[PDB]
């Protein structure tokens, strides 16, 4: 489509099926939150087009706003460009940067790291989840998401990583999100209630299959 923005994401083109990339997920959630129209183009990681090597080093997400626009990679560049070009609806965030900053790396080091550092990585992960949980609790009058009642830039970045964390850790390690992280559990329920989240939910098997590719 030359009519709306194209978002190249990880998918199965032969089945028109979105897959599990959390950074693609972040861009997609950003577009849904601003109710901007888009069209998904699925990249099969076992058969990537040669031009994607030049545009992004082989990576997704990539967007393409039209025939005269260039390809633009990096979910960070994309969401900031998004906020500059479309200030309404806003996705700007008061949340400090340090929060959730090591959720995904610690969770990954748990899944696919050396055993000797696993105990430490578990500890660090739980500090991250503690930070997010406390933050959502102190702001729960504004709403259950980092953006109160609606999706935030922090929601768009952190909710996919948390999704991968709970699903993959429960499947591969029997690990579970403690019941004391109340605000995290109602955060997950709130996200699962959102139509923006429902539109681009790839599902838990997509996550499992994505990570089985490395364990």
CATH, residue 67: 3.40.30.10
Dist. CA 215–CA 213, nearest whole Å? 6
Whether residues 104 and 208 share a domain: the answer is yes
Question: Three-class SS of residue 70?
Answer: coil
Q: Which range of residues forms the domain containing residue 57?
A: 1-90
Whether residues 46 and 57 share a domain: the answer is yes
Q: Which helix (H) or strand (E) holds 180?
A: none
Whether residues 15 and 114 share a domain: the answer is no
Domain boundary among the residues 54, 75, 90 is at: 90
Active-site residue identified among 9, 18, 21, 109: 21
21 is known as an active-site residue: yes
- Best CA proximity match to 6, nearest among 76, 90, 70, 89: 70
Whether residues 136 and 150 share a domain: the answer is yes
118-138 helix and 103-112 helix, angle to the nearest 10 degrees:
150
Whether residues 6 and 49 share a domain: the answer is yes
- Cα-Cα-Cα-Cα torsion 153, 51, 69, 28, nearest 10 degrees, comes to -20
Q: Report the structure determination method.
A: X-ray
- Residue 179 DSSP one-character state: T
170: Cβ contacts below 8 Å, ≥ 6 apart? 176
Dist. CA 149–CA 151, nearest whole Å? 7
Domain boundary among the residues 90, 109, 124 is at: 90
- Best CA proximity match to 83, nearest among 44, 131, 26, 137: 26
Tokens encoding 191 = 């996200």
Whether residues 152 and 205 share a domain: the answer is yes
Whether residues 80 and 121 share a domain: the answer is no
Bridge-based pairing of strands 62-64 and 72-73 is: antiparallel
Dist. CA 162–CA 33, nearest whole Å? 18
Domain boundary among the residues 48, 69, 90 is at: 90
Q: Which residues in the chain belong to E strands, given as ranges?
A: 5-12, 17-18, 38-43, 62-64, 72-73
Q: Could you tell me the resolution of this structure in angstroms? A: 2.5
Whether residues 79 and 101 share a domain: the answer is no
Domain total of the chain: 2
């Amino acid at each position: 489509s030359n009519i709306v923005t194209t978002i190249y994401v990880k998918g199965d083109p032969a089945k028109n099926k979105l897959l599990d990339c959390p950074f693609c997920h972040r861009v997609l959630l950003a577009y849904e939150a601003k109710k901007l129209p888009y069209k998904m183009e699925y990249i099969d990681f076992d058969n990537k087009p040669a031009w994607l090597l030049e545009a992004s080093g082989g990576k997704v997400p990539v967007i393409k706003e039209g025939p005269d626009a260039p390809y633009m990679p990096d979910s960070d560049v994309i969401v900031v460009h998004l906020e500059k070009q479309h200030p309404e609806p806003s996705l700007q965030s008061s949340v400090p940067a340090e929060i959730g900053a090591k959720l995904f790396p610690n969770f990954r080091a748990i899944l696919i790291g050396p055993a000797a550092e696993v105990a430490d990585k578990v500890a660090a992960l739980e500090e991250q989840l503690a930070g997010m949980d406390d933050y959502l609790r102190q702001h729960e009058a504004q709403g259950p998401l980092f953006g109160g009642q609606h999706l935030n830039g922090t929601d768009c970045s952190l909710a996919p990583k948390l999704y991968h964390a709970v699903v993959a850790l429960k499947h591969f390690k029997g690990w579970e999100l403690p019941a004391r992280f109340t605000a995290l559990h109602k955060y997950l329920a709130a996200l699962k209630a959102l139509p923006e989240w429902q539109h681009v939910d790839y599902g838990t098997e997509a996550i499992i299959a994505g990570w089985e590719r490395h364990i």
